[PDB]
Design an enzyme around this catalytic site. Sequence first.
Site, PDB file in Angstrom:
ATOM      1  N   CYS A 107       0.794  -1.215   0.000  1.00 30.86           N
ATOM      2  CA  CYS A 107       0.000   0.000   0.000  1.00 30.86           C
ATOM      3  C   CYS A 107       0.841   1.287   0.000  1.00 30.86           C
ATOM      4  O   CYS A 107       0.434   2.285   0.568  1.00 30.86           O
ATOM      5  CB  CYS A 107      -0.914  -0.020   1.219  1.00 30.86           C
TER       6      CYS A 107
HETATM    7 CL   LIG Z   1       2.614   6.011  -1.556  1.00 33.01          CL
END
Ligand SMILES: [Cl-]
Length: 108
Positions: A7
């Site tokens: 992420c």
């Molecule tokens: Cl990022």
Amino acid sequence: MNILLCCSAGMSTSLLVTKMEAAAKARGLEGKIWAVSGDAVKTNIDQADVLLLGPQVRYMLSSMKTLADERNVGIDVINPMHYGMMNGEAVLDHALTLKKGENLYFQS
Ligand SMILES: [Cl-]
């Protein structure tokens, strides 16, 4: 072979993406390999064949798995050794394995 990483698109993950791209080209493999932050996964998951999470966001697996399973996208957390040692060839293999196993003739 489209591979989405989550992420973060920080130094480490981006370095891995570059190495994964070199590995895919060297197998004449066409596709997109890219990293996004968690808020972008929903809008990028449909283009992906596989979603891979960095070892530092392993805690997001349960929740990301519900989405991936639903979209028929392979999902897993990157092996901490492949990640820490920046082994792009290995992570590309991991992704390929998830996609191949996923379409496995005998069931699903
Ligand atoms: Cl990022």
